[PDB]
Design a protein around this nucleic acid. Structure first.
Ligand SMILES: [Mg+2]
Ligand SMILES: [Mg+2]
Ligand SMILES: [Mg+2]
Ligand SMILES: [Mg+2]
Ligand SMILES: [Mg+2]
Ligand SMILES: [Mg+2]
Ligand SMILES: [Mg+2]
Ligand SMILES: [Mg+2]
Ligand SMILES: [Mg+2]
Ligand SMILES: [Mg+2]
Ligand SMILES: [Mg+2]
Ligand SMILES: [Mg+2]
Ligand SMILES: [Mg+2]
Ligand SMILES: [Mg+2]
Ligand SMILES: [Mg+2]
Ligand SMILES: [Mg+2]
Ligand SMILES: [Mg+2]
Ligand SMILES: [Mg+2]
Lengths: 155, 82, 97, 95, 116, 127, 54, 100
RNA sequence: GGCCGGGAACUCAAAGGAGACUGCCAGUGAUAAACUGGAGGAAGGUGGGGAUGACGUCAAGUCAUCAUGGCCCUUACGACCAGGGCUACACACGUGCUACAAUGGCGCAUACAAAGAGAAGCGACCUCGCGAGAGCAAGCGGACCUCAUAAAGUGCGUCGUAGUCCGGAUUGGAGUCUGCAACUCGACUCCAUGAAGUCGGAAUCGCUAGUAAUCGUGGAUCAGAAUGCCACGGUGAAUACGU
C-alpha cells in the first residue's frame, strides 16, 4: 500500500520439530482453516522423506527447499505498446515463500492416492532435481537470464 | 396429503347433492366449485362439471378417478406454446 | 420472602432497591443483599426507507434490568409495610411468599 | 454485443425494438470488444429520453440523450457513445 | 455372482454389490444380509454356492427388475390416460411436483433449445 | 500458600492455581494429554514453564469454561503467566519479553448490515 | 497503511523521477533544505542514466 | 389501508373468538383416534359448516395506526415505519438506538 | 451428583470507580507544530468495532405506509362472496445454495461454545413408532424450567481414485403434521429411483487479521411455509517489494 504496514505477526514454531519455518509450510498447505488436518499431512510426509533419505527431517525437508528456491524473478512493466519483463533480486523471505508454495502447488497436481504421498514424493524428487516444482524455478530463471539487458532501469 | 386418521375430505354441499344423484336417479351434470373434494365411489358414473376459474368443465367420473380431487381434472391455465 | 425488581432505567432501579433495603432495615428485619441479575436486551432491526433500499436500517434495543432482594427473618411489622409502599412508576415489583 | 431493452413509461413495440437494435449494431465498428449492454427509454410529461450502459473489455460506458421523439432521442444517444467508445479504444491502442 | 438374472460385482462388499439389483437400495441390502444371515463386509467372490442361494431366496421376497420396471410404467401410463394435471406434466415432460419452470427445470426439459 | 491467576483468550476464561511439586497438571478433573488432543494446545499450555524451567518443580491445577480448544489452551497460558509472575515477581521481565503477559484482545468482529459477514460484501458483476 | 513511509527516501525518488522524465531542477517542491537535498540528489543521479537510455 | 380492509379484520376477530370453543371441541373429536367413526365423520361435516372468517388463521396482523399489512412487529403492534416515527419522539419506553 | 452442611476466595452477574494523556525518555525539527525510536503498561499514539452523514447534487426513490394541493369516479374506479391468478414457460440476465470427491464418503466411539426465544406460549420425563411424529402430561413469565445432544474436531474401522460406497437432481410408491381446506400451490418422513456434473471461454467479484476461507447455533416475520435477511460463537490462513 501507499503507506507502510506496521505490525508483523508471530508464527508459533512446530509442536514437534520446533521450527517457525515448518510452521509457515503448514499454513501454506492448510485449507479452509483446518490446521490439524494439515499438521498431520505434513508430518506423515516427512516420516516418509526421513525413511528413505535417512537424513533427519528438519534437515532433509531443507534439501528439497534448496533445490527449488529462486534467486531472480521477473516483474512486468508496460513500455510503449509493449510490456517489459525485467529481472530483479529476490528477498530471502520471499524465496522461502515461493519454494514452499511451488512445492505445494506441484504436489497437488499429481495422481497419487494420499495427499501425504504426493507431498512426500514431491519433496523427494525436489531433492534430486526432478519434479514440476523444480521445473518451475528453472523456467523462472531462464526468463530473467533472457532479458538481462533490462536489469538496470528503475522505470 | 391429509392425515389418514382425519378421513377423506369432501365439502358437504357437494356430498349431499350426490345422494340425490345416486338415490333419486337423475342423469344431469352438476355444477360445483368444490375442487377440494376427493372423489368418492358413489360418484362413479355421474358427469360433474367442476369450475376451473372461469368455466365449468365436465368430468365423467370412473373407477380410476377415486381418491383424487375434482380440481385435478379441471386445468386452470391455457398454454399452447411460444 | 423474595422481591424481584425490574425496570428499563438503571438509575431508577438502584433507587427502589435502596428504598426497600432501607424499610427492611427499619421494620426490624435482615435483608439478604440486593443482588443484580442478567439484563435482557431485546433488539429490533427496521427498514428506515418507506420503499426499496433494503440495506438502510436502524438497530433499536430495550435493556431490561433485574434486581433481587430477600427477607431473612420476616418481622410481622415488615410484611404489611413492604407490601404497602407506593413505588416509582415504571418499576415492576413481585413480592412473593 | 448482447442487448437488453427496458421501458420506463413506454411500450416497446416492434419498430422501437427493431429500430434500436439496428442503430446499436454500428457501435461495434468503434470498438470490437463490446459485451452485454442495457438500454432504457423514458417518457416524463413531454421529455423523451434514452440512456444505455455498455459493458466493454475493461470499462463501463454510459450516456443518455433527450429528443422530442424517442427516435430522435436514440439518434442523439448513438452519437454520444460513438465518441466515448473511440476515446476508450485509443487509450488502449496507445503505442 | 448371478442374482435376479443379472450379474453382480464379485469384488464388492455384499452390501455394496447387492445394490446393483434394480429395486434394492441400501436399506434392503442391509436387511437381505441378515434375513439371510450373511455378513456385510464379506465380498461376493468368497462365498459358497449355498450362501449365494439362501441369498437368492431373500431377494425374491421383493418386487425387482423387469417386474418393478413394469409396475412403475403402469402407474405412469395410468396417470396419462386419466389426463389429470399430474398426467400431463408427464406428457409435456415437465416438473410434476410443483417446481418452478420460469427458470431452471432443466432435468425434465433437458438441455436448452435456443430461439430463432 | 498457593498462587493464582485468571486468564482469558477470545471467549475463554481459565482460573489456575499453582503449587510447589514434581510437575502434575489437572484440567477439569482430567489430565493434560486427555483433555487436549491437539499437540499445538499442549505446546502452548507448557511453554511459559518450558521458558523458566519450572516444568517439573511446580505442580499446577486448572479449570476452564467457555471458548473452544485454542481459546482455552491460550487462556490457560495467560493464567499461568499471571500466577507464575506472582509466586515470583522476579520472572515478569523474562515472561514479558516472550509476549505472554499481554491479554490478546482480538475478538470476533460483529456482523454488519448489508454484508454477508463482518467485511465480506455481496458480489456485483460488471461482466 | 498504518504508518507513513520515509519522507527522505520518497523525496529522493520523486527527484529521480522528475530527473529521468527531464524536468528542470527548480521544479523541486521542497524548501525544507533536508528534503531538498534528497530531491536534487535523485535528480542528478537520474541525469546520468538518461544518457544511456533511448 | 382501505377502510374496508381495516374493517374485515374486526369482523374476522369478533367471529374467531365467539366460535372459538365450538371449533376447538369440534376439532378435538376429529383428532381422537380412539373415538366413534360415526362421531368423527359427523364432525368433519360440522366444522366445515360454521363460518370461514371464524378461523384464527384467517386474520392478518395490521399496524394498529395505519393499517399496513407488511413489516409488522408484535412487541409494538405497529409497522416498522410507525415504530421508527414513535421511537424517535421517545413514545416507546426504553427503546433507543443501539451499538455493539 | 456443588450432592450436603458450609464457604464469599475464585469464575461470573452489574452498579460504581481507576486507566492512555504523545504524560515520561532519547534523536531529528524554524528556540515551533510535529516526526522516528525507547520505557513502563492489559492496552500506545484515532488500541479494536459501532452510532454519528456538512452546504449541496441527481425536477434520484416513495401520492400503494401515512399525510396532502389539484384532478377524476359516485346503482361504481365504492361494497360483499366463491373459484382462479400473482407459482404460467421456446428463452435472456442478476443474486445464491449444493456439488464435481480421498485435506474426502460411510459406520461406530468421544471432546470443547456464544448469543437468543418462551404464556396460554417453551414443553421435559414415560409409553408407542424404522421415521416424520402420536399419547400422556412434570417444570418454567425463566442466571432456576423448556427449546437444546453444537459442528467442524478427535480415535478405530472401512472405501482405493471409479462417473465410484463421489453427487442427490428427477420420478413412482407409501406416510406425518399445520390448517374449514394442502388438485392447481405447503413443510417434512420412509422405501425405490440415482440425472447433469471430472473444477468451468471471453470476461468478472470479495477480502489487509480473529479478516478471508470454512463449521455449526439463534432470531424477526410466522397456523404451516428460508438455500433469503438480521444476529452469535468454533477452527483460522495467505501476502503488501513497492507506486
Ligand atoms: Mg431470557
Ligand atoms: Mg444520426
Ligand atoms: Mg434412499
Ligand atoms: Mg441484499
Ligand atoms: Mg464467523
Ligand atoms: Mg385512507
Ligand atoms: Mg397468516
Ligand atoms: Mg512503544
Ligand atoms: Mg465525529
Ligand atoms: Mg422522476
Ligand atoms: Mg378471494
Ligand atoms: Mg412474485
Ligand atoms: Mg459455496
Ligand atoms: Mg452417496
Ligand atoms: Mg419461532
Ligand atoms: Mg422408539
Ligand atoms: Mg481497507
Ligand atoms: Mg451459515
Amino acid at each position: 500500500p501507499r503507506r507502510r504496514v506496521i505490525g508483523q505477526r508471530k508464527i508459533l514454531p512446530d509442536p514437534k520439530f520446533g521450527s517457525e519455518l515448518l510452521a509457515k509450510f503448514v499454513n501454506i498447505l492448510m485449507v479452509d482453516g483446518k490446521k490439524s488436518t494439515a499438521e498431520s499431512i505434513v508430518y506423515s510426509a516427512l516420516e516418509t522423506l526421513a525413511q528413505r533419505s535417512g537424513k533427519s527431517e528438519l534437515e532433509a525437508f531443507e534439501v528439497a527447499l534448496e533445490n527449488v528456491r529462486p534467486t531472480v524473478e521477473v516483474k512486468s512493466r508496460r513500455v510503449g505498446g509493449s510490456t517489459y519483463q525485467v529481472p530483479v533480486e529476490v528477498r530471502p523471505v520471499r524465496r522461502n515463500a515461493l519454494a514452499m508454495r511451488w512445492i505445494v502447488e506441484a504436489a497437488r497436481k499429481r495422481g497419487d492416492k494420499s495427499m501425504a504421498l504426493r507431498l512426500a514424493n514431491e519433496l523427494s524428487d525436489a531433492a534430486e532435481n526432478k519434479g514440476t516444482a523444480v521445473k518451475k524455478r528453472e523456467d523462472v530463471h531462464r526468463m530473467a537470464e533472457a532479458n538481462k539487458a533490462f536489469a538496470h532501469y528503475r522505470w | 396429503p391429509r392425515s389418514l386418521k382425519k378421513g377423506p375430505f369432501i365439502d358437504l354441499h357437494l356430498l349431499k347433492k350426490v345422494e340425490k344423484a345416486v338415490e333419486s336417479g337423475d342423469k344431469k351434470p352438476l355444477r360445483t366449485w368444490s375442487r377440494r373434494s376427493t372423489i368418492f365411489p358413489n360418484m362413479i358414473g355421474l358427469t360433474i362439471a367442476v369450475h376451473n376459474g372461469r368455466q365449468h368443465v365436465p368430468v365423467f367420473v370412473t373407477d380410476e378417478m377415486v381418491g383424487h380431487k375434482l380440481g385435478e381434472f379441471a386445468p386452470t391455465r391455457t398454454y399452447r406454446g411460444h | 420472602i423474595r422481591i424481584r425488581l425490574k425496570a428499563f432505567d438503571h438509575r431508577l432501579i438502584d433507587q427502589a432497591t435502596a428504598e426497600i433495603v432501607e424499610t427492611a432495615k427499619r421494620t426490624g428485619a435482615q435483608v439478604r443483599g440486593p443482588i443484580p441479575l442478567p439484563t435482557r436486551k431485546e433488539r429490533f432491526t427496521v427498514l428506515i426507507s418507506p420503499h426499496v433500499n433494503k440495506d438502510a436500517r436502524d438497530q433499536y434495543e430495550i435493556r431490561t434490568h433485574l434486581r433481587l432482594v430477600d427477607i431473612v427473618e420476616p418481622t410481622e411489622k415488615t410484611v404489611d409495610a413492604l407490601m404497602r409502599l407506593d413505588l416509582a412508576a415504571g418499576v415492576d415489583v413481585q413480592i412473593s411468599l | 454485443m448482447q442487448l437488453n431493452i427496458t421501458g420506463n413509461n413506454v411500450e416497446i413495440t416492434e419498430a422501437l425494438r427493431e429500430f434500436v437494435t439496428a442503430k446499436f449494431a454500428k457501435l461495434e465498428q468503434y470498438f470490437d470488444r463490446i459485451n452485454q449492454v442495457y438500454v432504457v427509454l423514458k417518457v416524463e410529461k413531454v421529455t423523451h429520453t434514452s440512456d444505455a450502459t455498455l459493458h466493454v473489455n475493461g470499462g463501463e460506458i454510459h450516456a443518455s440523450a433527450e429528443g422530442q421523439d424517442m427516435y430522435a432521442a436514440i439518434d442523439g444517444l448513438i452519437d454520444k457513445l460513438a465518441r466515448q467508445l473511440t476515446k476508450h479504444k485509443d487509450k488502449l491502442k496507445q503505442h | 455372482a448371478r442374482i435376479a438374472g443379472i450379474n453382480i460385482p464379485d469384488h464388492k462388499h455384499a452390501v455394496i454389490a447387492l445394490t446393483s439389483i434394480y429395486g434394492v437400495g441400501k436399506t434392503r441390502s442391509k436387511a437381505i444380509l441378515a434375513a439371510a444371515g450373511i455378513a456385510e463386509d464379506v465380498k461376493i467372490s468368497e462365498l459358497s454356492e449355498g450362501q449365494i442361494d439362501t441369498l437368492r431366496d431373500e431377494v425374491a421376497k421383493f418386487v425387482v427388475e423387469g417386474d418393478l420396471r413394469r409396475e412403475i410404467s403402469m402407474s405412469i401410463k395410468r396417470l396419462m390416460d386419466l389426463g389429470c394435471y399430474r398426467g400431463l406434466r408427464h406428457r409435456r415432460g415437465l416438473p410434476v411436483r410443483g417446481q418452478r419452470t420460469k427458470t431452471n427445470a432443466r432435468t425434465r426439459k433437458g438441455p436448452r433449445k435456443p430461439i430463432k | 500458600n498457593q498462587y493464582y491467576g485468571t486468564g482469558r483468550r477470545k471467549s475463554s476464561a481459565a482460573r489456575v492455581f499453582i503449587k510447589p511439586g514434581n510437575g502434575k497438571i489437572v484440567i477439569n478433573q482430567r489430565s493434560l494429554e486427555q483433555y487436549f488432543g491437539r499437540e499445538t494446545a499442549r505446546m502452548v499450555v507448557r511453554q511459559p514453564l518450558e521458558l523458566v524451567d519450572m516444568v517439573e518443580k511446580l505442580d499446577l491445577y486448572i479449570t476452564v469454561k467457555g471458548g473452544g480448544i485454542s481459546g482455552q489452551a491460550g487462556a490457560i497460558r495467560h493464567g499461568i503467566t499471571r500466577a507464575l509472575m506472582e509466586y515470583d515477581e522476579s520472572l515478569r521481565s523474562e515472561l514479558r519479553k516472550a509476549g505472554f503477559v499481554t491479554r490478546d484482545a482480538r475478538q470476533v468482529e460483529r456482523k454488519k448490515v448489508g454484508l454477508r459477514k463482518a467485511r465480506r460484501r455481496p458480489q456485483f458483476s460488471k461482466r | 497503511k498504518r504508518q507513513k513511509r520515509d519522507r527522505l527516501e520518497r523525496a529522493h525518488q520523486r527527484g529521480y523521477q522528475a530527473g529521468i522524465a527531464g524536468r528542470s531542477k527548480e521544479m523541486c517542491p521542497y524548501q525544507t533544505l533536508n528534503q531538498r537535498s534528497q530531491w536534487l540528489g535523485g535528480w542528478r543521479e537520474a541525469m546520468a542514466d538518461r544518457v544511456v537510455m533511448a | 389501508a382501505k377502510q374496508s380492509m381495516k374493517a374485515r379484520e374486526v369482523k374476522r376477530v369478533a367471529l374467531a373468538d365467539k366460535y372459538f370453543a365450538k371449533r376447538a371441541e369440534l376439532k378435538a373429536i376429529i383428532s381422537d383416534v380412539n373415538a366413534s367413526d360415526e362421531d368423527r365423520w359427523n364432525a368433519v361435516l360440522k366444522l366445515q359448516t360454521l363460518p370461514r372468517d371464524s378461523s384464527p388463521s384467517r386474520q392478518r396482523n395490521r399496524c394498529r395506526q395505519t393499517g399496513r399489512p407488511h413489516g409488522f412487529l408484535r412487541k409494538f403492534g405497529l409497522s416498522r415505519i410507525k415504530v421508527r416515527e414513535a421511537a424517535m419522539r421517545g413514545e416507546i419506553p426504553g427503546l433507543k438506538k443501539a451499538s455493539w
